[PDB]
Design a protein around this nucleic acid. Structure first.
Ligand SMILES: *P(=O)(O)OC[C@H]1O[C@@H](n2cnc3c(N)ncnc32)[C@H](O)[C@@H]1O
Length: 562
DNA sequence: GCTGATGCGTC
DNA sequence: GTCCGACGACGCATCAGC
DNA sequence: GTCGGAC
């Protein structure tokens, strides 16, 4: 194998040459120099071949390391680890410079310059093996061995080789060249293949010959693909960006992005960046937080499947999602049995997705898709979504295919525009409530502002806001206020709360109530509230226990804000 | 059993 | 307009010391 | 995820 015959110092030399290079091309040139040399050596050495550039690549692009588990080490633990071995003074200057560095690599390089041995004898593979050892020992929760392995690494290397090793352990090289540049240099199809593998060794083994190339590249089973993303659409321009044809509107979830590979009783789960969570959601119907519950959800004719969706936390008590059990909400299928669905239209994918399994509420579901045409519908969807305490809405082309790691390209996400100023902090009082349509708690609150006192007494309603119970602090707030709600009588209202056209279902006297910090996009004129204005896209950012009920912002503050 | 420190991967 | 590299929040995990 | 700089 090649990695056994190549000194780590040469790699470090290349990395140094790349780092100190000013322009995009020189960097590319030095890399090319190294890579070409490596390939030549490979050709010479091997004359069945599993060997490839991977042992180098994984060091060159350590952020793409997958096979090796986490090191369990960052700058501080490394400083703590290093200071012990060299036996530096505990309180000494060097140790102090290490300890608080705020470029840890460089600072560590200058400290080890006089201390380190003349120079290192280790190859790339040895380094790989020792790093493997560290990761493994970390996974096994034994530090005593980690110390040993790292010590072996330190003893056999030059200062420069370790500044690089450190930067490989931190998994940031700071070369000044993007990974796609590296990939473009290595092979023309490298990026394309990495996007549907997220396996550096796969990429390095398959594409080894720069002249040769792959035929059909696409989603595989048990191979992590970089999920398709959504660009931010801009406001009014939407109608033109959807092709003017019919389009899907669906809800914008805050879960985590998770894709599920299934064969029979065997399962694999991958995250956004291609990390394997299978230990969590489980590899089999007998283990994990998810798979056991969803195993019988699938239809009998389903053998092999690939799904992409948003993993959510579902409260069985309240029948809602909390930003208690793990729930997998699935918006796409890239594979079913012997058929690869990746190239089929979104419509077809939804059509198939509906048929592969039966929803289990709170365990596994299908995202709701609202077919739409007109901008007004999008607007309505946004404004309605915010009262559910969503973050926005999603809009998609029914005819668009799945394009891994492509932001935009048929997927759009709409959020409201929020100012970075005080329009994101308005501390205002809950003076009212409405009941949800289940719906056994307050769905929305009615919120108000006060007038400048010589406590206050009279309040003027400002805006409604969706109170739906999606975080604990909302339910707790709900519970705390139960005893204090009173039925609102339109013919005989309370004098403490002055209301416009909009009247609540129940009120609460301000002294028993709570201040909420509400962000909003902006203040607009309204005939429905006493202030004569309301909040566009209001949401509750925080509940305030640091503020008493009398601390509510006045009409003067609001007038100042508008 | 508790708690602050430190790592890891996410949106 | 595009790429892309610093940012910060969160939840969750261990674990040393009390 | 968002931001803001270099092209
Ligand atoms: P916001 O910009 O905070 O979130 C956007 C990302 O959320 C994920 N996502 C949520 N809901 C969906 C749906 N329905 N389809 C696809 N992706 C979804 C994506 O990762 C967004 O980029």
């Amino acid at each position: 194998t090649v990695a056994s015959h190549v000194p780590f110092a040469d790699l470090c030399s290349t990395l140094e040459r790349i780092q100190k290079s000013k322009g995009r091309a020189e960097k590319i040139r030095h890399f090319r120099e190294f890579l070409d040399s490596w390939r030549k050596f490979h050709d010479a050495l091997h004359k069945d071949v599993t060997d490839s550039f991977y042992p180098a690549m994984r060091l060159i692009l350590p952020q793409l390391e997958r096979e090796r588990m986490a090191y369990g080490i960052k700058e501080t633990m490394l400083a703590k680890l290093y200071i012990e071995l060299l036996n530096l003074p505990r309180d000494g200057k060097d140790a102090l410079k290490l300890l608080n560095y705020r470029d840890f690599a460089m600072i560590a390089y200058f400290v080890l310059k006089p201390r380190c041995l003349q120079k290192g004898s280790l190859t790339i593979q040895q380094v790989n093996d020792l790093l493997d050892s560290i990761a493994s020992n970390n996974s096994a929760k034994r530090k005593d061995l980690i110390k040993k392995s790292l010590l072996q690494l330190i003893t056999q290397s030059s200062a420069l080789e370790q500044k690089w090793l450190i930067r490989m352990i931190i998994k940031d090289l700071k070369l000044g060249v993007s990974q796609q540049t590296i990939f473009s240099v290595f092979h023309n199809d490298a990026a394309e293949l990495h996007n549907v593998t997220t396996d550096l060794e796969k990429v390095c083994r398959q594409l080894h010959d720069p002249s040769v190339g792959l035929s059909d590249i696409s989603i595989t089973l048990f191979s992590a693909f970089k999920p398709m993303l959504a660009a931010i659409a801009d406001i009014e321009h939407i109608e033109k960006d959807m092709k003017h044809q019919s389009f899907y509107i669906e809800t914008k979830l805050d879960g985590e992005r998770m894709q599920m590979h299934k064969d029979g009783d065997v399962y694999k789960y991958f995250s956004r960046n291609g990390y394997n969570y299978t230990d969590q959601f489980g590899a089999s119907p007998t283990e994990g937080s998810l798979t056991p519950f969803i195993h019988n959800a699938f239809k009998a004719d389903i053998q092999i499947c690939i799904l992409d969706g948003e993993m959510m936390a579902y409260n069985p008590n309240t029948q809602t999602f909390m930003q208690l059990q793990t729930c997998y909400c699935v918006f796409d299928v890239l594979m079913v049995n012997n058929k690869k669905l990746g190239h089929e239209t979104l419509r077809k994918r939804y059509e198939i997705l509906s048929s592969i399994f039966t929803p289990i509420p709170g365990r596994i579901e299908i995202v709701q898709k609202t077919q739409a045409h007109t901008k007004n519908e999008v607007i309505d969807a946004l404004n309605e979504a915010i009262d559910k305490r969503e973050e926005g809405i999603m809009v998609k082309q029914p005819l668009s295919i799945y394009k891994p790691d492509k932001r935009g390209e048929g997927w759009l996400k709409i959020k409201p525009e929020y100012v970075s100023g005080l329009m994101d902090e308005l501390d205002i009082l809950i003076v009212g409530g409405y009941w949800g349509k289940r719906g056994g708690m307050m769905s929305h609150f009615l919120c108000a502002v006060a007038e400048k006192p010589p406590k206050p007494s009279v309040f003027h309603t400002l805006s409604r806001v969706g109170s739906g119970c999606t975080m604990k602090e909302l339910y707790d707030l709900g519970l705390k206020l139960a005893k204090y709600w009173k039925p609102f009588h339109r013919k005989a209202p309370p004098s403490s709360i002055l209301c416009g056209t909009e009247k609540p279902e129940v009120y609460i006297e301000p002294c028993n109530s709570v201040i909420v910090q509400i962000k909003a996009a902006e203040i607009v004129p309204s005939d429905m509230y006493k202030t004569g204005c309301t909040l566009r896209f209001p949401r509750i950012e925080k509940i305030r226990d640091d503020k008493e009920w009398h601390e509510c912002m006045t009409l003067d503050d609001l007038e100042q804000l508008r």
